[PDB]
Amino acid sequence: GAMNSSNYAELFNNDIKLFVDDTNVYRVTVHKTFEGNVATKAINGCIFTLNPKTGHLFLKIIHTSVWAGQKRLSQLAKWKTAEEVSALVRSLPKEEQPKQIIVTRKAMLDPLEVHMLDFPNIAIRPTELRLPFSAAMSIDKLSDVVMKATEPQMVLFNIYDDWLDRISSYTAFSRLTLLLRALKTNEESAKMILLSDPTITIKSYHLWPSFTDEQWITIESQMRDLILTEYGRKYNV
Amino acid sequence: MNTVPFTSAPIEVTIGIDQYSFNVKENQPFHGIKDIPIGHVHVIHFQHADNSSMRYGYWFDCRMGNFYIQYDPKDGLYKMMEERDGAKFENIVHNFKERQMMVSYPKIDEDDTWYNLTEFVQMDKIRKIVRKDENQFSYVDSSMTTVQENELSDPAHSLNYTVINFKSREAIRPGHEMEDFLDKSYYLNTVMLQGIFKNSSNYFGELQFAFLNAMFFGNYGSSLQWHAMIELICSSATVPKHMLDKLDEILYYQIKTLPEQYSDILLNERVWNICLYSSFQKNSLHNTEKIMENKYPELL
Ligand SMILES: CC(=O)NCCc1cn2cccc(C)c2n1
């Protein structure tokens, strides 16, 4: 069954599970041709596959070469996503394979179910949450490795940095979704907010700045303001 | 011209023979059905006047034996039986014919409806879907579930239709996931036609039998089977040309014959709209699409 507000805490139990977001798999720029027609140019994309309990991110970079000579690319992108997710699961030891895979968009259900026929005991689930994982390309270090790639490549990150040393996975996931929601609503503001003070450096092995507990509380508050504001600026309230 | 004679009619009942039907009153002097066309399967079916629940009936081929209908007051239904003494059966049939206590199978000579609905239906194939090998005829009713329904509970009373499942390893070759799921030609032509059914006639026979059970008994598992076998063809990009033309005729006569008032339960909106308007074969079923649009434009 679908994942929603009411069964939210299941995300942080001890059953291995992965979120899969395909928004950024097939990415294009739209442009005018010399004749004045419109055309697309693909750019590198990525599959966002995230263990919400541990923070482990399996970032499969989707190189533009995979679209060469293919038709119906938005449809293909969903099947390619499912192919790569299935390959990832098959690559893991049995005790590390997920018990559930939650897809952020319903159109991934049939592609993933069909690619996972060999794994009848892995449940494929949709969600009623409007999660902001599309904004993962607003994280500078993620966007950079995607755009620099010259061939297909898997990169492993912990999207929580070292937060689980100090907070729970429920709290870590809530912080992540707040940050990403903010970046999706107003990327410029959100990013300014991270760098208001610049002494709080990002470690080389991290994605986000090294805030103290007290500085995170301030940051988190400022992202909630941003989101409310933009919600006013947008809806006029 | 063959005869299914009846011992008596002790309870009020609506009796069907193929697409015809008539009302028999409690203890009315009814002793069966004569002039039944040889060369086709037939179905004789029943709905008690007191319990319109449970439609039930018997598929049979008079070439395979002499059959009679007798009411059982213990089990409370009309039972088909075989008389192995041919003299005794012909003599009982001649007595009833002379006293004019039989209805005549009321076929109009111009009318090919029953032929068109049963063109590919064979008694020997029916007896493999409905397993009861000690009889030459086959019982079906409204409540019998299919093998595939049982998987998702008494298997002796199951409809053993061929399992079709579009999200199954049988349907999807490793490495052709997207290809095989969006274009089911492999599954239709190699797995089902060449592998399980052997030829298109046997496929069409099971399709036609499933439809008839859905229409005459309201058997839900049979309706599911009928639609799945349509959908498998319509979702295949590569179908023998003779099969597409024959499918259009088959479906035309099924839609023509369906009671106008039962279309809401027996016709699956998604499958028909997919098949007539989205699928690879969207332009290949001209007769079916014209009768569907003129008779059930609401469903579409
Ligand atoms: C004779 C006897 O035991 N009769 C009772 C039941 C019965 C047997 N029947 C065989 C052939 C045809 C018919 C109607 C039929 N009725």
Swiss-Prot record, chain A:
It is found in: Nucleus. Residues 7-237 are annotated as: RNase H homology domain. It comes from the Eukaryota. Functions as a scaffold that mediates the ordered assembly of spliceosomal proteins and snRNAs. Required for association of BRR2 with the spliceosomal U5 snRNP, and the subsequent assembly of the U4/U6-U5 tri-snRNP complex. Functions as a scaffold that positions spliceosomal U2, U5 and U6 snRNAs at splice sites on pre-mRNA substrates, so that splicing can occur. Interacts with both the 5' and the 3' splice site, as well as the branch region. Has a role in branch site-3' splice site selection. Associates with the branch site-3' splice 3'-exon region. Also has a role in cell cycle. Component of the U4/U6-U5 tri-snRNP complex composed of the U4, U6 and U5 snRNAs and at least PRP3, PRP4, PRP6, PRP8, PRP18, PRP31, PRP38, SNU13, SNU23, SNU66, SNU114, SPP381, SMB1, SMD1, SMD2, SMD3, SMX2, SMX3, LSM2, LSM3, LSM4, LSM5, LSM6, LSM7, LSM8, BRR2 and DIB1. The MPN (JAB/Mov34) domain has structural similarity with deubiquitinating enzymes, but lacks the residues that would bind the catalytic metal ion. Contains a region with structural similarity to reverse transcriptase, presenting the classical thumb, fingers and palm architecture, but lacks enzyme activity, since the essential metal-binding residues are not conserved. Present with 468 molecules/cell in log phase SD medium. This is Pre-mRNA-splicing factor 8. It comes from Saccharomyces cerevisiae (strain ATCC 204508 / S288c) (Baker's yeast). The gene is PRP8.
UniProtKB/Swiss-Prot annotation, chain B:
Keywords: Cytoplasm, mRNA processing, mRNA splicing, Nucleus, Phosphoprotein. GO terms for cellular component: cytoplasm; U5 snRNP. Phosphorylated on serine and tyrosine residues. It is found in: Cytoplasm; Nucleus. The modification Phosphoserine is found at residue 236. Residues 244-265 are annotated as: Leucine-zipper. It comes from the Eukaryota. GO terms for biological process: spliceosomal snRNP assembly; spliceosomal tri-snRNP complex assembly. Gene3D superfamilies: 2.60.34.20, Aar2, C-terminal domain-like (1.25.40.550). Belongs to the AAR2 family. Component of the U5 snRNP complex that is required for spliceosome assembly and for pre-mRNA splicing. Involved in splicing pre-mRNA of the A1 cistron and other genes that are important for cell growth. This is A1 cistron-splicing factor AAR2.
